Design an enzyme around this catalytic site. Structure first.
Site, short mmCIF file in Angstrom:
data_model
loop_
_atom_site.label_atom_id
_atom_site.label_comp_id
_atom_site.label_asym_id
_atom_site.label_seq_id
_atom_site.Cartn_x
_atom_site.Cartn_y
_atom_site.Cartn_z
CE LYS B 50 3.11 14.15 0.01
NZ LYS B 50 3.04 15.59 0.39
CG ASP B 100 -4.90 -4.79 1.67
OD1 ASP B 100 -5.02 -6.01 1.42
OD2 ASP B 100 -3.96 -4.08 1.22
NE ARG B 105 -4.59 3.75 -0.72
CZ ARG B 105 -3.55 2.93 -0.55
NH1 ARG B 105 -2.33 3.43 -0.54
NH2 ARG B 105 -3.72 1.62 -0.36
CG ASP B 167 -0.46 -8.78 0.05
OD1 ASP B 167 0.45 -8.17 0.66
OD2 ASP B 167 -1.66 -8.69 0.35
CE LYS B 193 3.15 -5.88 -0.73
NZ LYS B 193 2.25 -5.87 0.47
CG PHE B 232 8.65 2.43 -1.74
CD1 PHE B 232 7.33 2.01 -1.79
CD2 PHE B 232 8.91 3.78 -1.60
CE1 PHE B 232 6.28 2.94 -1.69
CE2 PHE B 232 7.87 4.72 -1.51
CZ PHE B 232 6.55 4.28 -1.56
CG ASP B 236 3.58 0.54 2.33
OD1 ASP B 236 3.09 1.68 2.40
OD2 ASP B 236 2.87 -0.49 2.27
CG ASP B 237 5.55 -4.17 4.79
OD1 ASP B 237 4.60 -3.77 4.07
OD2 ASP B 237 6.22 -5.20 4.53
O1 LIG Z 1 5.26 10.32 0.33
C1 LIG Z 1 4.42 9.54 -0.36
O2 LIG Z 1 3.35 9.94 -0.76
C2 LIG Z 1 4.89 8.13 -0.63
C3 LIG Z 1 4.91 7.46 0.83
C4 LIG Z 1 6.39 7.46 1.21
C5 LIG Z 1 6.98 7.10 2.43
C6 LIG Z 1 8.39 7.21 2.51
C7 LIG Z 1 9.14 7.64 1.40
C8 LIG Z 1 8.52 7.99 0.19
C9 LIG Z 1 7.11 7.89 0.14
N1 LIG Z 1 6.32 8.21 -0.97
C10 LIG Z 1 6.76 8.56 -2.23
O3 LIG Z 1 6.00 8.85 -3.15
O4 LIG Z 1 8.10 8.55 -2.38
C11 LIG Z 1 8.57 8.84 -3.73
C12 LIG Z 1 8.37 7.69 -4.74
C13 LIG Z 1 8.91 7.82 -6.04
C14 LIG Z 1 8.76 6.79 -6.98
C15 LIG Z 1 8.05 5.63 -6.63
C16 LIG Z 1 7.50 5.50 -5.34
C17 LIG Z 1 7.65 6.53 -4.40
O1 LIG Z 2 0.64 -2.57 2.17
P1 LIG Z 2 0.01 -2.70 0.68
O2 LIG Z 2 0.90 -3.68 -0.26
O3 LIG Z 2 -1.43 -3.12 0.66
C1 LIG Z 2 0.20 -1.06 -0.06
O4 LIG Z 2 1.57 -0.64 -0.10
C2 LIG Z 2 -0.42 -1.08 -1.46
N1 LIG Z 2 0.27 -1.88 -2.44
C3 LIG Z 2 -0.28 -2.83 -3.18
C4 LIG Z 2 0.71 -3.31 -4.00
N2 LIG Z 2 1.75 -2.61 -3.66
C5 LIG Z 2 1.51 -1.80 -2.76
P2 LIG Z 2 -0.82 0.11 0.97
O5 LIG Z 2 -0.11 0.22 2.36
O6 LIG Z 2 -0.65 1.54 0.30
O7 LIG Z 2 -2.22 -0.38 1.11
MG LIG Z 3 -3.20 -2.06 1.25
MG LIG Z 4 -2.39 -4.80 -0.09
MG LIG Z 5 1.06 -1.06 3.36
#
Ligand SMILES: O=C(O)[C@@H]1Cc2ccccc2N1C(=O)OCc1ccccc1
Ligand SMILES: O=P(O)(O)C(O)(Cn1ccnc1)P(=O)(O)O
Ligand SMILES: [Mg+2]
Ligand SMILES: [Mg+2]
Ligand SMILES: [Mg+2]
Ligand SMILES: O=C(O)[C@@H]1Cc2ccccc2N1C(=O)OCc1ccccc1
Ligand SMILES: O=P(O)(O)C(O)(Cn1ccnc1)P(=O)(O)O
Ligand SMILES: [Mg+2]
Ligand SMILES: [Mg+2]
Ligand SMILES: [Mg+2]
Lengths: 343, 343
Positions: B50, B100, B105, B167, B193, B232, B236-237
């Site tokens: 994105k 991981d 991806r 991590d 991280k 965030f 993500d988790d």
């Molecule tokens: O959609 C995506 O590709 C990533 C994955 C995601 C899940 C939930 C909410 C936002 C986002 N993202 C994202 O890029 O959000 C915007 C953002 C802006 C600055 C830093 C990190 C993410």
């Molecule tokens: O869960 P992760 O921290 O490994 C991850 O968010 C990547 N990452 C690594 C450091 N910060 C974020 P991804 O789920 O995209 O594999």
């Molecule tokens: Mg990962």
């Molecule tokens: Mg990781």
């Molecule tokens: Mg993750």
């Protein structure tokens, strides 16, 4: 011989380097476990070698910097920059060992092969790289050569990575194509993967610390240094197969890894149509019998004697380059380095 | 919404970025094959997302820099710095996917899993990192914020690597010890991280380009940005297991990887002695049946509803932090970013 009289103080500085890098924990207790891991990484991968690349920075520093300017703080910075070179080395070797499927390094099991480490070594390597810039800021941030060093280390890393890319691209696993192993390709690979960081980097760093930042002076030094680097990698390839394991501290993998080694290049240039076929059917494979076959072919083509001759000719060539390009720098700077790599 | 009106020009700049990085080949034809590999790496790993982290640099740049100073060259530099952030991201993700044991991806097979790539991806990742500094020198070398950006990117990388170390150290393969999955440990891991490079980095970069280099202004911004980053990573988790695969573009591996995920932490805090045992016997293993068991336990503890509640509370908390720390920066800078991460 100047290396032996500087080694002790240089090696003892390692304790301080570790102390300073692990003192970012006191202000951030939460990353303690990470800092502990870092210390373990540094002690395992930055210690155990000869430290000659780092020592080169120190040796050159004392030969380029006027004694009246070699104060305690200046020497401290010199030892630090020298360790930064060792860390850059460590960073690349940790990753190189994984990519080359190596088993040992500096007489011990490769970091990634250590039980419990595995691919986590990838991030460990990235941390070692990061440490370089942390030390530069901590010790040289106020120096006039600060930015020059930062860019030198970053540029040297890019060149090394370009070289590694060439190294790997020319050695596709399970894909043997001897036609790609040419002298021209070989020279380009070693120039980028080894010559810049092992020889130009250390000397260039010392030059910048000595205030020698002229593009002309750096270009002339590089003329000598890149040629030494080419010889050094050739010698490295030779030792991969013919070196004394108890001396090199590492197990050779070039043949199994289908690498564009100086040896295979020399082989292809002297091989008969029949020998060529033997090489083709036994190169790039893990079978010990096939590797042994390749080594027998090299011994049959007297490659060891060929290397010994090349070493003498190379030595004379490098010395000729020193007579031509050393000035205005002290010839000793290059001579000392040469004495270290040529027997 | 400011992101959508800047995206097009930002994405079209990628072509130029690639052009400039692959123009170091014309002067050094010998590394052509390496440059070709680099282009392939960049196109596969820097394109497909994105681009929000990079876009954040651009968006903030136009909101912080006075219109009369947003000349063509300045905007060019802004798009470049934004891409540097995307490259830093790419560098870490290529390596993170290997570490991981991830499969996909951005809707495609992970780079290291692509046939013919494998562990060579380690060096590919290092090259992506190097590109950052090559672009900074090429586009911003003459700018007053040059050194600030170099140090910002280097510092952000060190923090991210410290975080990655935490991590990985908290998630030993085949070694399940739920006792280490605490809320305190979790917060420290995600801060390092993810929070620094995904949120502080982009905004800080734009601030330095806008001439805002005050330690106080950066500290206040970081107060808001690190908290957004924590939210965030939690999100993500959550998505690693409960996210829509066709939307996330990646297969979750946290449970199998024995990770200190927000989910497992929330689970341990609400689990009964019996549920605790179920988690302990099924966590950190590759068996699909065991992973399914863990997910069932999470659904039984209404973790999804818990996350939805946390998202609302977090949103209100972050907005409160903006009222307190935004000044003297335009609140829109933080609001726009928040609108992008909260649904
Ligand atoms: O959609 C995506 O590709 C990533 C994955 C995601 C899940 C939930 C909410 C936002 C986002 N993202 C994202 O890029 O959000 C915007 C953002 C802006 C600055 C830093 C990190 C993410
Ligand atoms: O869960 P992760 O921290 O490994 C991850 O968010 C990547 N990452 C690594 C450091 N910060 C974020 P991804 O789920 O995209 O594999
Ligand atoms: Mg990962
Ligand atoms: Mg990781
Ligand atoms: Mg993750
Ligand atoms: O002995 C070692 O550990 C390495 C391996 C080797 C084989 C043959 C000749 C020299 C060397 N070395 C070495 O460090 O030589 C000195 C040196 C100095 C500057 C840059 C690279 C190498
Ligand atoms: O033979 P390589 O180039 O892999 C080696 O010399 C490492 N290296 C990597 C770049 N330059 C040198 P090593 O034999 O120490 O494994
Ligand atoms: Mg190797
Ligand atoms: Mg190698
Ligand atoms: Mg070798």
């Amino acid at each position: 011989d100047v290396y032996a009289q500087e080694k002790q103080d240089f090696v003892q500085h390692f304790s301080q380097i570790v102390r300073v890098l692990t003192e970012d924990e006191m202000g951030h207790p939460e990353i303690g476990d990470a800092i502990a891991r870092l210390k373990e990484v540094l002690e395992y991968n930055a210690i155990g070698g000869k430290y000659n690349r780092g020592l080169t920075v120190v040796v050159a520093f004392r030969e380029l910097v006027e004694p009246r300017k070699q104060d305690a703080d200046s020497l401290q910075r010199a030892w630090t920059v020298g360790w930064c070179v060792e860390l850059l080395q460590a960073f690349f070797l940790v990753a190189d060992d994984i990519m080359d499927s190596s088993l040992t390094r500096r007489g011990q099991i490769c970091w990634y092969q250590k039980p419990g480490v595995g691919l986590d070594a990838i991030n460990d390597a990235n941390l070692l790289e990061a440490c370089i810039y942390r030390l530069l800021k901590l010790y040289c941030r106020e120096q006039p050569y600060y930015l020059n060093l930062i860019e030198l280390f970053l540029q040297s890393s890019y060149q090394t990575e370009i070289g590694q890319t060439l190294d790997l691209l020319t050695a596709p696993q399970g894909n043997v194509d001897l036609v790609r192993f040419t002298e021209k390709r070989y020279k380009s690979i070693v120039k980028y993967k080894t010559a810049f960081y092992s020889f130009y980097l250390p000397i260039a760093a010392a030059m910048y610390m000595a205030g020698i930042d002229g593009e002309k002076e750096h270009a002339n030094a590089k003329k000598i240094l890149l040629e030494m680097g080419e010889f050094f990698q050739i010698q490295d390839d030779y030792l991969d197969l013919f070196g004394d394991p108890s001396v090199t501290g590492k197990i050779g993998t070039d043949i199994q890894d289908n690498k564009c080694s100086w040896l295979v290049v020399q082989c292809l240039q002297r091989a008969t149509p029949e020998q060529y076929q033997i090489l083709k059917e036994n190169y790039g494979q893990k079978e010990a019998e096939k590797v042994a076959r390749v080594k027998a072919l090299y011994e049959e083509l007297d490659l060891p004697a060929v290397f010994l001759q090349y070493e003498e000719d190379s030595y004379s060539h490098i010395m000729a380059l020193i007579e031509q390009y050393a000035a205005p720098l002290p010839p000793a700077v290059f001579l000392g380095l040469a004495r270290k790599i040529y027997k």
